[PDB]
Amino acid sequence: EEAFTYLCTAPGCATQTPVPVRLAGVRFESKIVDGGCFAPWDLEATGACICEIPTDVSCEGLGAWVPTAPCARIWNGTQRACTFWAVNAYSSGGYAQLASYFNPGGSYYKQYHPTACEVEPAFGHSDAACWGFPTDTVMSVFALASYVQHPHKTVRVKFHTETRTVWQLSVAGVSCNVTTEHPFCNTPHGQLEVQVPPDPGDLVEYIMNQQSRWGLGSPNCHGPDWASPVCQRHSPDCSRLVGATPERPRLRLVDADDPLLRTAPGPGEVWVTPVIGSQARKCGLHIRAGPYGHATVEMPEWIHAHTTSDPWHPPGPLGLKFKTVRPVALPRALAPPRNVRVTGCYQCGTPALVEGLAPGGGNCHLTVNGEDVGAFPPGKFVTAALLNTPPPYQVSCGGESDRASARVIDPAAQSFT
């Protein structure tokens, strides 16, 4: 009979007439675009207030004052910046330690004491933090900052394009997976056409390491999801950085009573302030850093509030159109395709070229590692298909499979091509 009924999209939803249709589940199909690794831009800073004029401005050379683990970690960070300021130099003796060796840029000091850091005079700054010197007060300040990639904050991200909500149905015990692309089901003596809502558009898959969390959109870096790691540090191969990068941090020596401290540092700015020591010939350092994007990202907290456990789908219901019509059975070729060549990339967003020869006896319903790439009449075929699976490629027309020739690169290799 020609019939109509609405089927809800929740677990337990089922209709009984004219033929029972049960909502078995909800899943999704897509064309994956693997972006690799993403992380927030984490400005990390360290340093030391030193009551001496050190001759080796490095983590090892400053080991007696600079915290060990933060120095080593920040030194290996992205867009490293470091400055060594001479507040009060040697009045006599020493080795390239007099005030004259601290010209702007510190080239005279660097000639005898090489360093990857900037060297600057700071003679008009307060030297009060360094006390207990009977004849010659000596004081220097070291600051080190970079964008450190924290492993606990790094997320693997897969963009989902051409998203198709899969409404898994059971029509009188027979499995039927309906989408906007394939909305028809066979019923005991007719055909069921399922009216489905539109697809949800692009999805963002945040891979926690293994758990997947879901975002709906591109994402939108201009809205509430602005702090997404996707909007920040991008590493396609989870090793090398690409695209947009902040400038090297701007380090400043700021005295405790400087009016500048009444304001907050800007993004990427690092202000260091010497703290008067409780011990003779020793001092502390107070560091004020302006994080990128005006805030520090707390990854488990961001993920929990800005993502869902499952991909989003519209509320429904589904329109079940029951028809007495039966589809015209076309002859299908079951023999595997011949001389199949696959060229390009997979999970990259650029359709790969699939070419070969479809065999006789009907249309070849071509699959590339189980992925449907369309049906082709017998003879030579050429198609541009978005592939989700890596090589080797098993090609079939619905029956037996054959190994295709492939020149296909991974998403990370595509990003560097």
Numbering used by the authors: 1 to 209, 214 to 421
The authors write:
The rubella glycoproteins (E1 and E2) are present as heterodimeric complexes or spikes on the surface of the virus. The averaged glycoprotein spike structure consists of a broad base below a narrower stalk and has an estimated resolution of 11.0 Å (at 0.143 FSC cut-off) and 14.9 Å (at 0.5 FSC cut-off). The top (external) part of the averaged glycoprotein spike has weaker density compared to its base, indicating that there is more variability in the region distal from the membrane. However, all fits resulted in similar orientations with the long direction of the known E1 structure roughly perpendicular to the viral membrane. Thus, the residual volume at the base of the averaged rubella glycoprotein spike would be sufficient to accommodate the ectodomain of E2 glycoprotein. Along glycoprotein rows, adjacent spikes were slightly rotated with respect to each other, along an axis perpendicular to the plane of the membrane. This analysis showed that along unbroken glycoprotein rows in rubella virions, the glycoprotein complexes are similarly oriented with respect to each other, such that E2 would most likely be located between adjacent E1 positions. The relative positions of the rubella glycoproteins, with an extended E1 conformation and with E2 at the base of the spike complex, is different from the glycoprotein heterodimer conformation observed in alphaviruses. The common antibody binding region on E1 (between residues 202 to 285) is exposed to the surrounding environment in the spike density, given the orientation of E1 as determined by the fitting results. In the rubella glycoprotein complex, the E1 protein extends out from the virion surface and does not appear to require E2 for shielding its two fusion loops. The observed variability in the glycoprotein spikes suggest that the tips of the E1 structures are flexible, which would help E1 to avoid non-productive membrane interactions at neutral pH.
Rubella virus is an enveloped, positive-stranded RNA virus with virions ranging from 500 Å to 900 Å in diameter. The structural components of rubella virus are comprised of three proteins, glycoproteins E1 (58kDa), E2 (42–47kDa), and the capsid protein (31kDa). In this report, we have used a combination of cryo-electron tomography, sub-tomogram averaging and in vitro assembly studies to elucidate the three-dimensional structure and assembly of rubella virions. Instead, the structure of rubella virus, as shown here, has an irregular helical organization of its surface glycoproteins and a pseudo-tetrameric inner nucleocapsid arrangement.
